[PDB]
Amino acid sequence: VISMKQLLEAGVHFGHQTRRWNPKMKKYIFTERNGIYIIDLQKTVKKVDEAFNFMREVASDNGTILFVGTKKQAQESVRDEAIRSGQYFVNHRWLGGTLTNFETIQKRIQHLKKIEKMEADGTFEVLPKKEVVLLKKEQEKLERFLGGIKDMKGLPDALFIVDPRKERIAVAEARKLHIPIIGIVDTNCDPDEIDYVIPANDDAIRAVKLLTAKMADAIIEVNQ
RNA sequence: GCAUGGUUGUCGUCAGCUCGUGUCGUGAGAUGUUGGGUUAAGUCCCGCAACGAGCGCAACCCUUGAUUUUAGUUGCCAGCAU
Ligand SMILES: [Mg+2]
Ligand SMILES: [Mg+2]
Ligand SMILES: [Mg+2]
Ligand SMILES: [Mg+2]
Ligand SMILES: [Mg+2]
């Protein structure tokens, strides 16, 4: 339900270098600009509605949603939007086999919870200096990595990614577990590997914000 | 002692040897254990399709080098006479 002028002001139509485009995106290309491909904004607004409509019923049952923000330009732009949805998100680094090997990652989550509970009530000054400093460094180490999904209880029902060229691991292991993926793609990504493709520029903070905001405020009410 | 249990030397106190789940390959297999510095050491951190763990490395043990308290005999003799 995002008007075309909003996207145009967001600079969404921009596409990557002409020398480095994926031919399957020819259906989404509009009058190649100087060294730059420009995409159909009408197709974009058509796809935004479809993704909006889909993402409702996966959380209508108070389900779970996992966002992925590996790209630098979308790191904070997804933390700021997952909190208002009460959902799970990944930043920094995507641990190999986060979804296929959920048992070991869950055990690491339990370890992190134990470390969190270590200092709340009990005593650590009894432990020597090396022990407490090593535990502090350890807890920062697996807090930066895991972060959100800390309270994640069970496998997700949908995914959200920014650059399906940069998290090949995420889509590769999400197609194996048969759970759908919605994400924005550039003029060089793979359409057929994403169920609900949405063509947009991924290199602009504004471009990712104007879509992740629509994703966030379309799930705040769906739970009710 | 080429049928064995037990015990021992050697590579060598060299720093390596593997596993569970995950992933790649039709298959034997592969990653983790490779890449950068770093150290006596897969010791440490960073990076990464891997996440962790186990036996070794290191630490816990004995001795030598300084010092406080209690203890003064058969030990010592500064200050006391023989
Ligand atoms: Mg023999
Ligand atoms: Mg090997
Ligand atoms: Mg050694
Ligand atoms: Mg090395
Ligand atoms: Mg070790």
PDB file of C-alpha atoms (C1' of nucleotides) and ligand atoms in Angstrom:
ATOM      1  CA  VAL A   1       0.000   0.000   0.000  1.00  0.00           C
ATOM      2  CA  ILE A   2       3.130   2.115  -0.410  1.00  0.00           C
ATOM      3  CA  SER A   3       2.618   4.765  -3.078  1.00  0.00           C
ATOM      4  CA  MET A   4       5.069   4.954  -5.962  1.00  0.00           C
ATOM      5  CA  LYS A   5       6.222   8.469  -5.056  1.00  0.00           C
ATOM      6  CA  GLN A   6       7.313   7.258  -1.613  1.00  0.00           C
ATOM      7  CA  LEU A   7       9.563   4.664  -3.254  1.00  0.00           C
ATOM      8  CA  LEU A   8      10.847   7.213  -5.771  1.00  0.00           C
ATOM      9  CA  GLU A   9      11.796   9.578  -2.945  1.00  0.00           C
ATOM     10  CA  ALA A  10      13.411   6.579  -1.244  1.00  0.00           C
ATOM     11  CA  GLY A  11      15.527   5.948  -4.354  1.00  0.00           C
ATOM     12  CA  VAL A  12      14.398   2.343  -4.661  1.00  0.00           C
ATOM     13  CA  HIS A  13      14.610   2.072  -8.466  1.00  0.00           C
ATOM     14  CA  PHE A  14      18.427   2.023  -8.446  1.00  0.00           C
ATOM     15  CA  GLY A  15      20.037  -1.174  -9.690  1.00  0.00           C
ATOM     16  CA  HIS A  16      23.549  -2.565  -9.650  1.00  0.00           C
ATOM     17  CA  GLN A  17      26.152  -2.293 -12.396  1.00  0.00           C
ATOM     18  CA  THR A  18      24.982  -3.388 -15.842  1.00  0.00           C
ATOM     19  CA  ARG A  19      28.013  -5.681 -16.152  1.00  0.00           C
ATOM     20  CA  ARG A  20      26.858  -7.719 -13.134  1.00  0.00           C
ATOM     21  CA  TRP A  21      23.139  -8.438 -13.498  1.00  0.00           C
ATOM     22  CA  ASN A  22      21.240 -11.723 -13.323  1.00  0.00           C
ATOM     23  CA  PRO A  23      19.290 -12.273 -16.570  1.00  0.00           C
ATOM     24  CA  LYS A  24      16.266 -13.776 -14.805  1.00  0.00           C
ATOM     25  CA  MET A  25      15.500 -10.241 -13.573  1.00  0.00           C
ATOM     26  CA  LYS A  26      14.766  -9.065 -17.128  1.00  0.00           C
ATOM     27  CA  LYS A  27      11.050  -9.183 -16.300  1.00  0.00           C
ATOM     28  CA  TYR A  28      11.620  -6.475 -13.659  1.00  0.00           C
ATOM     29  CA  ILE A  29      13.839  -4.097 -15.663  1.00  0.00           C
ATOM     30  CA  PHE A  30      12.671  -0.713 -16.976  1.00  0.00           C
ATOM     31  CA  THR A  31      14.683   1.375 -19.448  1.00  0.00           C
ATOM     32  CA  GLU A  32      18.287   0.864 -18.342  1.00  0.00           C
ATOM     33  CA  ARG A  33      19.768   4.157 -17.114  1.00  0.00           C
ATOM     34  CA  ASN A  34      23.375   5.306 -17.491  1.00  0.00           C
ATOM     35  CA  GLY A  35      25.404   2.410 -16.100  1.00  0.00           C
ATOM     36  CA  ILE A  36      22.411   1.594 -13.898  1.00  0.00           C
ATOM     37  CA  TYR A  37      19.354  -0.624 -14.276  1.00  0.00           C
ATOM     38  CA  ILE A  38      16.013   0.875 -13.230  1.00  0.00           C
ATOM     39  CA  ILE A  39      13.201  -1.410 -12.113  1.00  0.00           C
ATOM     40  CA  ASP A  40       9.423  -1.255 -12.524  1.00  0.00           C
ATOM     41  CA  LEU A  41       8.019   0.583  -9.525  1.00  0.00           C
ATOM     42  CA  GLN A  42       4.550  -0.666 -10.482  1.00  0.00           C
ATOM     43  CA  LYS A  43       5.736  -4.260 -10.127  1.00  0.00           C
ATOM     44  CA  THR A  44       7.295  -3.208  -6.819  1.00  0.00           C
ATOM     45  CA  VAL A  45       4.024  -1.862  -5.428  1.00  0.00           C
ATOM     46  CA  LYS A  46       2.265  -4.980  -6.715  1.00  0.00           C
ATOM     47  CA  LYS A  47       4.720  -7.179  -4.798  1.00  0.00           C
ATOM     48  CA  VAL A  48       4.640  -5.141  -1.573  1.00  0.00           C
ATOM     49  CA  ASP A  49       0.910  -5.811  -1.228  1.00  0.00           C
ATOM     50  CA  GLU A  50       1.412  -9.546  -1.786  1.00  0.00           C
ATOM     51  CA  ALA A  51       4.203  -9.821   0.787  1.00  0.00           C
ATOM     52  CA  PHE A  52       2.132  -7.773   3.248  1.00  0.00           C
ATOM     53  CA  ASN A  53      -0.845 -10.079   2.714  1.00  0.00           C
ATOM     54  CA  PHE A  54       1.212 -13.254   3.120  1.00  0.00           C
ATOM     55  CA  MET A  55       3.070 -12.208   6.267  1.00  0.00           C
ATOM     56  CA  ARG A  56      -0.235 -11.740   8.123  1.00  0.00           C
ATOM     57  CA  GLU A  57      -1.426 -15.341   8.385  1.00  0.00           C
ATOM     58  CA  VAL A  58       1.973 -16.703   9.441  1.00  0.00           C
ATOM     59  CA  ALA A  59       1.751 -14.634  12.645  1.00  0.00           C
ATOM     60  CA  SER A  60      -2.053 -14.585  12.934  1.00  0.00           C
ATOM     61  CA  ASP A  61      -1.671 -17.612  15.231  1.00  0.00           C
ATOM     62  CA  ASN A  62       0.828 -15.724  17.432  1.00  0.00           C
ATOM     63  CA  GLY A  63       3.652 -17.390  15.530  1.00  0.00           C
ATOM     64  CA  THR A  64       7.317 -16.521  15.156  1.00  0.00           C
ATOM     65  CA  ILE A  65       9.195 -14.394  12.621  1.00  0.00           C
ATOM     66  CA  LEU A  66      12.962 -14.256  12.067  1.00  0.00           C
ATOM     67  CA  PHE A  67      14.671 -11.339  10.321  1.00  0.00           C
ATOM     68  CA  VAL A  68      18.213 -11.412   8.927  1.00  0.00           C
ATOM     69  CA  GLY A  69      20.400  -8.315   8.759  1.00  0.00           C
ATOM     70  CA  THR A  70      23.863  -9.545   7.798  1.00  0.00           C
ATOM     71  CA  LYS A  71      24.347  -6.594   5.442  1.00  0.00           C
ATOM     72  CA  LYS A  72      26.074  -3.591   6.997  1.00  0.00           C
ATOM     73  CA  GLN A  73      23.481  -1.092   5.751  1.00  0.00           C
ATOM     74  CA  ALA A  74      20.647  -3.073   7.390  1.00  0.00           C
ATOM     75  CA  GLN A  75      22.210  -4.117  10.712  1.00  0.00           C
ATOM     76  CA  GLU A  76      20.636  -1.550  13.039  1.00  0.00           C
ATOM     77  CA  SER A  77      17.739  -1.055  10.606  1.00  0.00           C
ATOM     78  CA  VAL A  78      16.444  -4.507  11.562  1.00  0.00           C
ATOM     79  CA  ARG A  79      17.150  -4.357  15.306  1.00  0.00           C
ATOM     80  CA  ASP A  80      15.091  -1.163  15.449  1.00  0.00           C
ATOM     81  CA  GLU A  81      12.199  -2.938  13.694  1.00  0.00           C
ATOM     82  CA  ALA A  82      12.169  -6.397  15.295  1.00  0.00           C
ATOM     83  CA  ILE A  83      11.685  -4.998  18.812  1.00  0.00           C
ATOM     84  CA  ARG A  84       8.403  -3.270  17.933  1.00  0.00           C
ATOM     85  CA  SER A  85       7.228  -6.630  16.552  1.00  0.00           C
ATOM     86  CA  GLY A  86       8.465  -8.736  19.476  1.00  0.00           C
ATOM     87  CA  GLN A  87      10.142 -11.102  17.019  1.00  0.00           C
ATOM     88  CA  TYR A  88      13.584 -12.581  16.418  1.00  0.00           C
ATOM     89  CA  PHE A  89      16.423 -11.161  14.345  1.00  0.00           C
ATOM     90  CA  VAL A  90      20.017 -11.899  13.353  1.00  0.00           C
ATOM     91  CA  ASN A  91      22.815  -9.334  13.004  1.00  0.00           C
ATOM     92  CA  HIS A  92      26.604  -9.433  12.700  1.00  0.00           C
ATOM     93  CA  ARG A  93      27.282 -13.062  11.742  1.00  0.00           C
ATOM     94  CA  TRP A  94      24.956 -15.913  10.781  1.00  0.00           C
ATOM     95  CA  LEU A  95      26.138 -19.025  12.612  1.00  0.00           C
ATOM     96  CA  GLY A  96      26.567 -21.969  10.266  1.00  0.00           C
ATOM     97  CA  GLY A  97      23.683 -24.372  10.696  1.00  0.00           C
ATOM     98  CA  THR A  98      21.611 -22.093  12.921  1.00  0.00           C
ATOM     99  CA  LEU A  99      18.391 -23.767  11.727  1.00  0.00           C
ATOM    100  CA  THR A 100      19.559 -27.234  10.639  1.00  0.00           C
ATOM    101  CA  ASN A 101      21.573 -27.767  13.840  1.00  0.00           C
ATOM    102  CA  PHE A 102      19.148 -26.109  16.253  1.00  0.00           C
ATOM    103  CA  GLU A 103      19.961 -28.517  19.111  1.00  0.00           C
ATOM    104  CA  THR A 104      23.566 -27.424  19.684  1.00  0.00           C
ATOM    105  CA  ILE A 105      22.660 -23.754  19.234  1.00  0.00           C
ATOM    106  CA  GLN A 106      19.857 -24.241  21.762  1.00  0.00           C
ATOM    107  CA  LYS A 107      22.359 -25.736  24.210  1.00  0.00           C
ATOM    108  CA  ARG A 108      24.570 -22.681  23.684  1.00  0.00           C
ATOM    109  CA  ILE A 109      21.516 -20.518  24.401  1.00  0.00           C
ATOM    110  CA  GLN A 110      21.057 -22.431  27.661  1.00  0.00           C
ATOM    111  CA  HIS A 111      24.718 -21.774  28.478  1.00  0.00           C
ATOM    112  CA  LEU A 112      24.163 -18.058  27.869  1.00  0.00           C
ATOM    113  CA  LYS A 113      21.083 -18.084  30.108  1.00  0.00           C
ATOM    114  CA  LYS A 114      23.113 -19.757  32.858  1.00  0.00           C
ATOM    115  CA  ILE A 115      25.837 -17.118  32.493  1.00  0.00           C
ATOM    116  CA  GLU A 116      23.187 -14.388  32.705  1.00  0.00           C
ATOM    117  CA  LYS A 117      21.812 -15.953  35.895  1.00  0.00           C
ATOM    118  CA  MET A 118      25.330 -16.397  37.320  1.00  0.00           C
ATOM    119  CA  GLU A 119      25.724 -12.823  38.595  1.00  0.00           C
ATOM    120  CA  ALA A 120      22.102 -11.790  39.216  1.00  0.00           C
ATOM    121  CA  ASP A 121      21.803 -13.500  42.608  1.00  0.00           C
ATOM    122  CA  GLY A 122      24.861 -15.657  43.279  1.00  0.00           C
ATOM    123  CA  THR A 123      28.418 -14.559  43.965  1.00  0.00           C
ATOM    124  CA  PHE A 124      31.343 -14.389  41.540  1.00  0.00           C
ATOM    125  CA  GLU A 125      33.931 -12.609  43.715  1.00  0.00           C
ATOM    126  CA  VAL A 126      34.655 -16.015  45.262  1.00  0.00           C
ATOM    127  CA  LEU A 127      35.959 -17.126  41.865  1.00  0.00           C
ATOM    128  CA  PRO A 128      39.530 -16.010  41.080  1.00  0.00           C
ATOM    129  CA  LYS A 129      40.336 -13.057  38.857  1.00  0.00           C
ATOM    130  CA  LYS A 130      41.166 -15.138  35.777  1.00  0.00           C
ATOM    131  CA  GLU A 131      37.868 -17.020  36.037  1.00  0.00           C
ATOM    132  CA  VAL A 132      35.695 -13.907  36.241  1.00  0.00           C
ATOM    133  CA  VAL A 133      37.531 -12.046  33.475  1.00  0.00           C
ATOM    134  CA  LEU A 134      37.368 -15.077  31.166  1.00  0.00           C
ATOM    135  CA  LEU A 135      33.657 -15.553  31.885  1.00  0.00           C
ATOM    136  CA  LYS A 136      32.987 -11.870  31.183  1.00  0.00           C
ATOM    137  CA  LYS A 137      34.821 -12.041  27.854  1.00  0.00           C
ATOM    138  CA  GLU A 138      32.987 -15.278  27.036  1.00  0.00           C
ATOM    139  CA  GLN A 139      29.574 -13.787  27.815  1.00  0.00           C
ATOM    140  CA  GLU A 140      30.231 -10.765  25.611  1.00  0.00           C
ATOM    141  CA  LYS A 141      31.428 -13.159  22.899  1.00  0.00           C
ATOM    142  CA  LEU A 142      28.233 -15.220  22.793  1.00  0.00           C
ATOM    143  CA  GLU A 143      26.010 -12.211  23.452  1.00  0.00           C
ATOM    144  CA  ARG A 144      27.173 -10.386  20.327  1.00  0.00           C
ATOM    145  CA  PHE A 145      26.754 -13.555  18.249  1.00  0.00           C
ATOM    146  CA  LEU A 146      23.417 -14.911  19.472  1.00  0.00           C
ATOM    147  CA  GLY A 147      21.645 -11.809  20.778  1.00  0.00           C
ATOM    148  CA  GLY A 148      18.043 -11.948  19.669  1.00  0.00           C
ATOM    149  CA  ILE A 149      16.607 -15.482  19.247  1.00  0.00           C
ATOM    150  CA  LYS A 150      17.724 -15.816  22.864  1.00  0.00           C
ATOM    151  CA  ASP A 151      14.139 -16.549  23.947  1.00  0.00           C
ATOM    152  CA  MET A 152      13.284 -18.217  20.623  1.00  0.00           C
ATOM    153  CA  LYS A 153      11.187 -21.310  21.400  1.00  0.00           C
ATOM    154  CA  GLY A 154      10.925 -23.540  18.347  1.00  0.00           C
ATOM    155  CA  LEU A 155      11.552 -23.333  14.622  1.00  0.00           C
ATOM    156  CA  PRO A 156      10.243 -20.276  12.744  1.00  0.00           C
ATOM    157  CA  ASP A 157       7.400 -20.106  10.256  1.00  0.00           C
ATOM    158  CA  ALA A 158       8.840 -17.469   7.889  1.00  0.00           C
ATOM    159  CA  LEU A 159      12.064 -15.587   7.202  1.00  0.00           C
ATOM    160  CA  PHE A 160      13.016 -12.064   6.171  1.00  0.00           C
ATOM    161  CA  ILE A 161      16.367 -11.281   4.536  1.00  0.00           C
ATOM    162  CA  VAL A 162      17.874  -8.280   2.762  1.00  0.00           C
ATOM    163  CA  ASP A 163      20.549  -9.596   0.370  1.00  0.00           C
ATOM    164  CA  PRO A 164      19.883 -13.161  -0.850  1.00  0.00           C
ATOM    165  CA  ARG A 165      23.337 -12.940  -2.429  1.00  0.00           C
ATOM    166  CA  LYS A 166      25.016 -12.347   0.954  1.00  0.00           C
ATOM    167  CA  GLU A 167      23.204 -14.935   3.103  1.00  0.00           C
ATOM    168  CA  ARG A 168      23.383 -17.849   0.667  1.00  0.00           C
ATOM    169  CA  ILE A 169      23.730 -20.000   3.800  1.00  0.00           C
ATOM    170  CA  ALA A 170      20.400 -18.762   5.176  1.00  0.00           C
ATOM    171  CA  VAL A 171      18.363 -19.445   2.031  1.00  0.00           C
ATOM    172  CA  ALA A 172      20.230 -22.699   1.390  1.00  0.00           C
ATOM    173  CA  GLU A 173      19.327 -24.090   4.808  1.00  0.00           C
ATOM    174  CA  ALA A 174      15.828 -22.575   4.815  1.00  0.00           C
ATOM    175  CA  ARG A 175      14.904 -24.250   1.527  1.00  0.00           C
ATOM    176  CA  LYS A 176      15.975 -27.553   3.112  1.00  0.00           C
ATOM    177  CA  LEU A 177      13.623 -27.249   6.112  1.00  0.00           C
ATOM    178  CA  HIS A 178      10.678 -26.155   3.909  1.00  0.00           C
ATOM    179  CA  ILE A 179       9.890 -22.770   5.447  1.00  0.00           C
ATOM    180  CA  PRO A 180       9.100 -19.827   3.141  1.00  0.00           C
ATOM    181  CA  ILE A 181      11.355 -16.811   2.653  1.00  0.00           C
ATOM    182  CA  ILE A 182      10.376 -13.220   1.853  1.00  0.00           C
ATOM    183  CA  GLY A 183      13.109 -10.733   1.047  1.00  0.00           C
ATOM    184  CA  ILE A 184      14.188  -7.885  -1.179  1.00  0.00           C
ATOM    185  CA  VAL A 185      16.467  -8.574  -4.136  1.00  0.00           C
ATOM    186  CA  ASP A 186      18.684  -6.425  -6.326  1.00  0.00           C
ATOM    187  CA  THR A 187      19.098  -6.689 -10.103  1.00  0.00           C
ATOM    188  CA  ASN A 188      21.579  -9.542  -9.614  1.00  0.00           C
ATOM    189  CA  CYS A 189      19.953 -11.979  -7.159  1.00  0.00           C
ATOM    190  CA  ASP A 190      18.092 -15.248  -7.793  1.00  0.00           C
ATOM    191  CA  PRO A 191      14.296 -14.901  -8.158  1.00  0.00           C
ATOM    192  CA  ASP A 192      13.337 -18.567  -8.262  1.00  0.00           C
ATOM    193  CA  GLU A 193      14.959 -19.302  -4.896  1.00  0.00           C
ATOM    194  CA  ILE A 194      12.750 -16.770  -3.039  1.00  0.00           C
ATOM    195  CA  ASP A 195       9.013 -17.447  -2.815  1.00  0.00           C
ATOM    196  CA  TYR A 196       7.842 -13.828  -2.466  1.00  0.00           C
ATOM    197  CA  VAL A 197      10.504 -11.724  -4.201  1.00  0.00           C
ATOM    198  CA  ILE A 198      10.185  -7.935  -3.881  1.00  0.00           C
ATOM    199  CA  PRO A 199      12.456  -5.945  -6.231  1.00  0.00           C
ATOM    200  CA  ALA A 200      14.150  -2.989  -4.560  1.00  0.00           C
ATOM    201  CA  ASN A 201      17.519  -1.349  -4.074  1.00  0.00           C
ATOM    202  CA  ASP A 202      19.319  -2.933  -1.122  1.00  0.00           C
ATOM    203  CA  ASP A 203      22.281  -0.538  -0.856  1.00  0.00           C
ATOM    204  CA  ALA A 204      20.289   2.378   0.608  1.00  0.00           C
ATOM    205  CA  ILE A 205      19.276   2.680   4.257  1.00  0.00           C
ATOM    206  CA  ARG A 206      16.183   4.587   3.121  1.00  0.00           C
ATOM    207  CA  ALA A 207      15.176   1.854   0.673  1.00  0.00           C
ATOM    208  CA  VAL A 208      15.385  -0.894   3.294  1.00  0.00           C
ATOM    209  CA  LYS A 209      13.662   1.289   5.904  1.00  0.00           C
ATOM    210  CA  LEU A 210      10.607   2.071   3.766  1.00  0.00           C
ATOM    211  CA  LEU A 211       9.986  -1.688   3.394  1.00  0.00           C
ATOM    212  CA  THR A 212      10.980  -2.982   6.827  1.00  0.00           C
ATOM    213  CA  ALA A 213       8.674  -0.355   8.340  1.00  0.00           C
ATOM    214  CA  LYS A 214       5.805  -1.804   6.312  1.00  0.00           C
ATOM    215  CA  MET A 215       6.803  -5.269   7.500  1.00  0.00           C
ATOM    216  CA  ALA A 216       6.905  -4.151  11.139  1.00  0.00           C
ATOM    217  CA  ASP A 217       3.578  -2.307  11.281  1.00  0.00           C
ATOM    218  CA  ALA A 218       1.776  -5.109   9.421  1.00  0.00           C
ATOM    219  CA  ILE A 219       2.524  -7.603  12.223  1.00  0.00           C
ATOM    220  CA  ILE A 220       1.853  -5.360  15.243  1.00  0.00           C
ATOM    221  CA  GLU A 221      -1.899  -5.784  14.727  1.00  0.00           C
ATOM    222  CA  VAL A 222      -2.040  -9.256  13.159  1.00  0.00           C
ATOM    223  CA  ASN A 223      -1.483 -10.986  16.512  1.00  0.00           C
ATOM    224  CA  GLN A 224      -4.783  -9.663  17.900  1.00  0.00           C
TER     225      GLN A 224
ATOM    226  C1'   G B   1      56.603 -63.303  24.149  1.00  0.00           C
ATOM    227  C1'   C B   2      53.864 -65.023  16.515  1.00  0.00           C
ATOM    228  C1'   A B   3      48.233 -67.921  21.227  1.00  0.00           C
ATOM    229  C1'   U B   4      48.067 -64.440  26.076  1.00  0.00           C
ATOM    230  C1'   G B   5      47.218 -61.074  31.007  1.00  0.00           C
ATOM    231  C1'   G B   6      50.620 -57.971  33.633  1.00  0.00           C
ATOM    232  C1'   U B   7      55.140 -54.748  33.166  1.00  0.00           C
ATOM    233  C1'   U B   8      58.805 -51.879  30.020  1.00  0.00           C
ATOM    234  C1'   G B   9      61.770 -49.182  25.817  1.00  0.00           C
ATOM    235  C1'   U B  10      61.268 -46.004  21.492  1.00  0.00           C
ATOM    236  C1'   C B  11      59.405 -41.957  18.215  1.00  0.00           C
ATOM    237  C1'   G B  12      59.067 -37.915  22.487  1.00  0.00           C
ATOM    238  C1'   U B  13      57.360 -34.061  27.138  1.00  0.00           C
ATOM    239  C1'   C B  14      57.492 -34.026  20.060  1.00  0.00           C
ATOM    240  C1'   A B  15      52.447 -31.306  19.851  1.00  0.00           C
ATOM    241  C1'   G B  16      49.374 -33.517  18.113  1.00  0.00           C
ATOM    242  C1'   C B  17      44.976 -37.684  17.959  1.00  0.00           C
ATOM    243  C1'   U B  18      39.625 -37.905  17.504  1.00  0.00           C
ATOM    244  C1'   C B  19      34.258 -37.469  18.332  1.00  0.00           C
ATOM    245  C1'   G B  20      28.499 -35.868  18.485  1.00  0.00           C
ATOM    246  C1'   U B  21      25.114 -32.851  15.629  1.00  0.00           C
ATOM    247  C1'   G B  22      25.252 -30.001  11.121  1.00  0.00           C
ATOM    248  C1'   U B  23      26.788 -29.262   5.861  1.00  0.00           C
ATOM    249  C1'   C B  24      29.382 -30.497   0.719  1.00  0.00           C
ATOM    250  C1'   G B  25      30.418 -35.117  -2.710  1.00  0.00           C
ATOM    251  C1'   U B  26      27.067 -40.686  -6.685  1.00  0.00           C
ATOM    252  C1'   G B  27      31.355 -42.774  -3.693  1.00  0.00           C
ATOM    253  C1'   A B  28      36.013 -43.597  -0.754  1.00  0.00           C
ATOM    254  C1'   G B  29      36.104 -38.887   1.547  1.00  0.00           C
ATOM    255  C1'   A B  30      35.880 -33.208   3.055  1.00  0.00           C
ATOM    256  C1'   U B  31      35.059 -29.040   6.857  1.00  0.00           C
ATOM    257  C1'   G B  32      35.489 -28.306  12.365  1.00  0.00           C
ATOM    258  C1'   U B  33      41.836 -29.309  12.873  1.00  0.00           C
ATOM    259  C1'   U B  34      42.571 -24.551   6.986  1.00  0.00           C
ATOM    260  C1'   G B  35      43.715 -18.396   6.661  1.00  0.00           C
ATOM    261  C1'   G B  36      46.686 -13.507  10.094  1.00  0.00           C
ATOM    262  C1'   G B  37      49.643 -12.320  13.859  1.00  0.00           C
ATOM    263  C1'   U B  38      51.395 -14.766  18.388  1.00  0.00           C
ATOM    264  C1'   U B  39      53.795 -18.217  21.646  1.00  0.00           C
ATOM    265  C1'   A B  40      57.711 -23.486  24.667  1.00  0.00           C
ATOM    266  C1'   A B  41      52.600 -25.574  22.958  1.00  0.00           C
ATOM    267  C1'   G B  42      45.568 -26.861  17.546  1.00  0.00           C
ATOM    268  C1'   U B  43      48.622 -21.974  23.900  1.00  0.00           C
ATOM    269  C1'   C B  44      45.262 -16.852  22.548  1.00  0.00           C
ATOM    270  C1'   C B  45      42.430 -13.782  19.973  1.00  0.00           C
ATOM    271  C1'   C B  46      40.513 -12.424  14.979  1.00  0.00           C
ATOM    272  C1'   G B  47      38.234 -14.502  10.342  1.00  0.00           C
ATOM    273  C1'   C B  48      35.232 -18.368   8.382  1.00  0.00           C
ATOM    274  C1'   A B  49      29.893 -23.725   6.891  1.00  0.00           C
ATOM    275  C1'   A B  50      30.165 -24.620  11.162  1.00  0.00           C
ATOM    276  C1'   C B  51      28.594 -25.255  16.686  1.00  0.00           C
ATOM    277  C1'   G B  52      30.611 -27.677  20.655  1.00  0.00           C
ATOM    278  C1'   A B  53      33.247 -31.731  23.234  1.00  0.00           C
ATOM    279  C1'   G B  54      37.079 -35.529  24.662  1.00  0.00           C
ATOM    280  C1'   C B  55      42.335 -37.421  25.402  1.00  0.00           C
ATOM    281  C1'   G B  56      47.284 -34.507  25.413  1.00  0.00           C
ATOM    282  C1'   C B  57      49.710 -28.809  26.212  1.00  0.00           C
ATOM    283  C1'   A B  58      49.083 -25.396  30.775  1.00  0.00           C
ATOM    284  C1'   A B  59      47.528 -25.325  36.000  1.00  0.00           C
ATOM    285  C1'   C B  60      46.751 -28.567  41.015  1.00  0.00           C
ATOM    286  C1'   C B  61      52.012 -31.984  43.574  1.00  0.00           C
ATOM    287  C1'   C B  62      57.671 -32.282  45.658  1.00  0.00           C
ATOM    288  C1'   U B  63      62.326 -29.472  46.195  1.00  0.00           C
ATOM    289  C1'   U B  64      65.726 -24.741  46.124  1.00  0.00           C
ATOM    290  C1'   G B  65      66.051 -19.324  46.570  1.00  0.00           C
ATOM    291  C1'   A B  66      63.254 -14.237  50.784  1.00  0.00           C
ATOM    292  C1'   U B  67      60.209 -13.495  54.966  1.00  0.00           C
ATOM    293  C1'   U B  68      55.837 -13.476  59.681  1.00  0.00           C
ATOM    294  C1'   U B  69      53.682 -16.392  64.121  1.00  0.00           C
ATOM    295  C1'   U B  70      53.834 -20.163  67.602  1.00  0.00           C
ATOM    296  C1'   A B  71      58.217 -24.026  69.395  1.00  0.00           C
ATOM    297  C1'   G B  72      63.048 -23.910  72.109  1.00  0.00           C
ATOM    298  C1'   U B  73      65.851 -30.032  72.968  1.00  0.00           C
ATOM    299  C1'   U B  74      69.791 -33.658  72.391  1.00  0.00           C
ATOM    300  C1'   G B  75      69.901 -27.488  68.636  1.00  0.00           C
ATOM    301  C1'   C B  76      72.425 -22.042  68.839  1.00  0.00           C
ATOM    302  C1'   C B  77      75.918 -18.929  72.729  1.00  0.00           C
ATOM    303  C1'   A B  78      75.152 -11.835  71.701  1.00  0.00           C
ATOM    304  C1'   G B  79      74.826  -9.941  76.346  1.00  0.00           C
ATOM    305  C1'   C B  80      76.690 -13.359  82.421  1.00  0.00           C
ATOM    306  C1'   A B  81      80.683 -15.915  85.455  1.00  0.00           C
ATOM    307  C1'   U B  82      83.622 -20.842  85.115  1.00  0.00           C
TER     308        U B  82
HETATM  309 MG    MG C   1      55.710 -58.675  21.438  1.00  0.00          MG
HETATM  310 MG    MG C   2      41.156 -34.310   9.031  1.00  0.00          MG
HETATM  311 MG    MG C   3      55.628 -28.897  25.282  1.00  0.00          MG
HETATM  312 MG    MG C   4      47.390 -21.592  12.743  1.00  0.00          MG
HETATM  313 MG    MG C   5      43.447 -27.653  23.981  1.00  0.00          MG
END
